Amino acid sequence: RPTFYRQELNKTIWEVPERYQNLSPVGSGAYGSVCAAFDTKTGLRVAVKKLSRPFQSIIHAKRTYRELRLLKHMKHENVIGLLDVFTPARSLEEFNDVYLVTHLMGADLNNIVKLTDDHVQFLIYQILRGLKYIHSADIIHRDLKPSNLAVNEDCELKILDFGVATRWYRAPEIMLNWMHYNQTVDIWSVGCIMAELLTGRTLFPGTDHIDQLKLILRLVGTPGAELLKKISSESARNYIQSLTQMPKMNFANVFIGANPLAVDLLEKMLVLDSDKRITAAQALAHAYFAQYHDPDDEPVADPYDQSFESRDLLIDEWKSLTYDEVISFVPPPL
């Protein structure tokens, strides 16, 4: 039970172990505030997030428990991982604040831009490697986009969720609930990201859900008979057939002058039918990534138990489950 010190910044009490020194605000919003800090135990530079009113409602409490469970399980080089979690509460009774600690990321993908073909290969490779890992434990990101990707000076990437319109990167089946989905909603997003790096521009910059679909269908074409057969909703089916029939464009006439193996991968990623879309694992083995792919260093995750998600609990039960998870936390080795 280490020594805590208090201090105020951004109009909020921070109460942290002495281990963590020199705190400096880096951004706050509805969900939590974040500080950079020096970690006197590893000489490393870290980021500390104070959750905003984590047990105010049933939604907040369950969400707080979800983030903590998730970060405790993720142990992979291309995925954010949990260095430490603490509370200044001595007991469950007085337990009201949660703090999460991770490696301090510098600049996101949004900030670091066009760019070389070798750079795109390496950046997209690392995202897929990280996606193979989380998808293997049935975890879906759902909000993959450049501002959720951290990239340091070595060009090393990590997937995270700081919590660019999201809709610009969203799979059309999730955006509209028009057809069932799987893990490959995130594969759609990656294709939108890769295109952007290849050409310097947002691929599909829609101004609402309808305009977004319009732009997308302009590129991939209206759904064929095969895909139209699996659209569950009657409304959605009508809309689509009531549109004016757009053809599939030739991707080489769109990504003009780009590396042909990347044009090919883009075509396997940006397919409308989600039964046909390439997975993370299959995509690691494509010829675009020949210089990086090693099937013996692209690991999968331990089984992840997410049954809690179907439960309807009271606030005090989620709060108590969170506290347990704080107490059983064992740090990762140096």
Ligand SMILES: COc1cc2ncnc(Nc3cc(NC(=O)c4ccnc(N5CCOCC5)c4)ccc3C)c2cc1OCCN1CCCC1
């Ligand atoms: C310099 O600005 C920084 C740096 C940071 N470094 C490290 N961590 C953080 N933020 C952070 C995030 C989290 N949680 C998650 O990342 C999270 C939650 C849920 N799910 C995931 N997954 C889903 C599947 O894939 C794995 C990821 C991740 C926990 C603790 C911390 C500390 C930051 C934050 C940061 O700045 C934030 C504000 N800033 C203002 C300028 C732009 C953004």
